[PDB]
Ligand binder design. Sequence first.
Ligand SMILES: NC(=O)c1ccc[n+]([C@@H]2O[C@H](COP(=O)([O-])OP(=O)(O)OC[C@H]3O[C@@H](n4cnc5c(N)ncnc54)[C@H](OP(=O)(O)O)[C@@H]3O)[C@@H](O)[C@H]2O)c1
Length: 315
Amino acid sequence: STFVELSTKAKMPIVGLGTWQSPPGQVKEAVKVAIDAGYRHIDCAYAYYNEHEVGEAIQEKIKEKAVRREDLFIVSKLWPTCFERKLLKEAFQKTLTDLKLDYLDLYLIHWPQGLQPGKELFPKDDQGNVLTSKITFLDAWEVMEELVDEGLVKALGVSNFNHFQIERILNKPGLKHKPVTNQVECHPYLTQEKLIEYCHSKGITVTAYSPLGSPNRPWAKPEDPSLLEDPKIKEIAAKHKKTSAQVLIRFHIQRNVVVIPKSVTPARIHENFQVFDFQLSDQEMATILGFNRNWRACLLPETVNMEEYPYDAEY
Ligand SMILES: NC(=O)c1ccc[n+]([C@@H]2O[C@H](COP(=O)([O-])OP(=O)(O)OC[C@H]3O[C@@H](n4cnc5c(N)ncnc54)[C@H](OP(=O)(O)O)[C@@H]3O)[C@@H](O)[C@H]2O)c1
């Protein structure tokens, strides 16, 4: 399938363009190329400081008439430093202004742990400890649901949430809108079988980021596992006349998981989208699933303490 059905009955293109770390002076071209190559799902975030450029690219493609707003599925995320009623709506409106849109198809809590306000993604004290906040994601969720009922957000979702944190929201008194997706790191070394199974059992889809093991992430020792270099994956790729990256991307699609590979390289953007004309066999999917080691490439040590740290739980 080329899309996933959300609980709201809306369609989410199973493949989208990731933009984390995409330099501001390159993401605009990346989005234009992505749209020209066929992408209709763009994943954005306030914390990426590049939404203004994404918005310029979109506006231009709509202006050209190659696409209409309705053809695109735009995703953005609320940063934990803005859980507060006021700061939340300001961050949302700012995201809407930067992207030059009137509504978002999906708005996600970028991280469960509320953080101290300010122009800092991770405010730290004198020692360097990240200052958390009392405001919870349920507090933010209530106001985010307002955006939904006012038609400014088509659906809400979460990112980097373990199943407990999702349970907290599904069973919240007076729940108005259920999350439609949990965006988490997922690839062969971190298959997320339990979390995916838990989400699907609740009618919640899963969006996989860092599908290529994110071999870019700043500070990543040389002898760290490389999914793009693994001979077994390369072998499977070659038999299908595809690249490893295309296999790592196709992997999620066959598990009915949305995947958002990131790139600012026109050629790779093009490459990551040629994943709808082939099928991995049952044995190949098993071989790939067998790579799991619950190894996280993301992981930010400075967050291991936070009460809402989501990676200690089983799933
Ligand atoms: N919610 C969160 O906490 C969170 C965290 C991280 C990321 N994300 C989202 O997930 C998206 C995934 O990006 P990511 O950095 O995490 O990891 P990724 O997509 O697995 O890997 C991105 C890296 O792979 C390179 N690349 C892309 N296509 C390639 C190909 N076909 N062959 C070889 N190399 C290729 C990119 O290089 P070039 O750009 O140089 O081509 C970049 O250095 C992000 O853009 C973002 O939207 C969300």
